[PDB]
Structure formats: structure tokens, C-alpha cells
Amino acid sequence: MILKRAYDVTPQKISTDKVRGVRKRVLIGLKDAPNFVMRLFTVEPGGLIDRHSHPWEHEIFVLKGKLTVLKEQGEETVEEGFYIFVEPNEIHGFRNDTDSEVEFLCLIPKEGGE
Amino acid sequence: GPSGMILKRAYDVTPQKISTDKVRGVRKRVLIGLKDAPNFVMRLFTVEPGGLIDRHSHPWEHEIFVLKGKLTVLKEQGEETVEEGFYIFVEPNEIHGFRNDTDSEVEFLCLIPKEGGE
Numbered sequence A: 001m002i003l004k005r006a007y008d009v010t011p012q013k014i015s016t017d018k019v020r021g022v023r024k025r026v027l028i029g030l031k032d033a034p035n036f037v038m039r040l041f042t043v044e045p046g047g048l049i050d051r052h053s054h055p056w057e058h059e060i061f062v063l064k065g066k067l068t069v070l071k072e073q074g075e076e077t078v079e080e081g082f083y084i085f086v087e088p089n090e091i092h093g094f095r096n097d098t099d100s101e102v103e104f105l106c107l108i109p110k111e112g113g114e
Numbered sequence B: 001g002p003s004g005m006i007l008k009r010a011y012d013v014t015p016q017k018i019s020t021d022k023v024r025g026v027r028k029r030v031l032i033g034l035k036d037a038p039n040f041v042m043r044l045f046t047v048e049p050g051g052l053i054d055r056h057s058h059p060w061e062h063e064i065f066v067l068k069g070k071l072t073v074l075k076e077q078g079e080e081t082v083e084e085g086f087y088i089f090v091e092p093n094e095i096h097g098f099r100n101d102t103d104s105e106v107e108f109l110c111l112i113p114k115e116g117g118e
């Protein structure tokens, strides 16, 4: 059994053509998990995960801040204490329009990798 | 399967009492349940002060994230308390349980493969 403070997992900085101002922690990855993986994302002020889709779902819980969720058309802001279920193949992305860091838990089935 | 995305305040789900031979002082909210989940389910558990999930095991894993409070985790050998911001991975068949030794509610997210129910 693994018990660990999430913050202590080293975050990975992401800065690409589609993702900027984002850090990813893999809390429960493919080494350990037989079916699905647990990640924790931190979105800096102004950070962006641009619209994309994939053949697997997301299950998300917003831990801190106000997260802007991009939809195929339009967007919706939600707060700490919201959960989000993104169906497979649905277009989605994320932005942080606030002045402080936003954090969310994100789980995907193993085929999504970590 | 269906398209779209659900975005919902977890507290809009009513916390339902869990009461079994091996659980007392616990409530649960099913957030992403069997009716919708392709692969795994998301629950939010509330452990009342003094609540207890006795040591047990089952043929599926748990993935847990502690949202609020100090959670005492029961292991096959001894126990360890963790707090908000900790995650826990419980392997299939590993003995585990939980206690809330504090005077306030403890909350944690708990995800299992959907073959284990909701």
C-alpha cells in the first residue's frame, strides 16, 4: 500500500504548441495501477490546455481555484469541489483566467497512458 | 457510448449512510457511477467522528485522494494517519481499513474499477 503526499511527487512542466503553463504529477501510474491512473494537474495563471480529444474518458475533481473548462463550443467555469466527467471522444480543454494556481485531480484508464 | 461532459458540485449529491457489518459512521456520495462510467467509478466518502471501516480486502484496487481532515489508515500491520492532500493506492487483495480519530468529518475520493460496483 502506498500512502504519499501528492505535493512531494515531482511535477513535470509542460510547454508545447497545445499546453502551456501546466504542471503534471503522476500520483498512481502504470507501474502500480492495473486499470486506471491518477494525475494531479496544476494550471498557472494564464495556463492553457487547448481543445483536444482522445478515445478515453476523464474523471476529474477540482481541488483548488476556478477552472475554465473548454467545450466543443464555448466554455464553463467551475470551482473547487466540482467533479467533471468527460465522455470518450468529447472535445475538451482547460484554462486558468485567475491570478492564482488552479489544481485538479484527473484519472484516465490505462490505455490513456499516464 | 454517449457524448458530452458532466460538471457538477459534488455536494449537490446527498451523502447516504453506509452501514454494514464492517462499516459504521460513514456516508458516501456516488459522483461518477455505474450508470455512466465506461471503466471506473468515483465516490466521495465522509467518515464521521469516530467512524470506522474495519480491516477488509477485495479482488479490486482502490485509488484514494484525501480531501479533508486526518484519516487513519489501517494496514495488515499497524496503522498510519494521513491528511488532506495525500493519495493512497491499495493493491487488489491488500488488507486495509480506515478510522476517523478526530472530532470533525474526514472526506476522501475513492475510485475503483466498475466491476467492483459503486
Ligand SMILES: [Zn+2]
Pocket: A052, A053, A054, A058, A092
Ligand atoms: Zn484530455
Ligand SMILES: [Zn+2]
Pocket: B056, B057, B058, B062, B096
Ligand atoms: Zn476497500
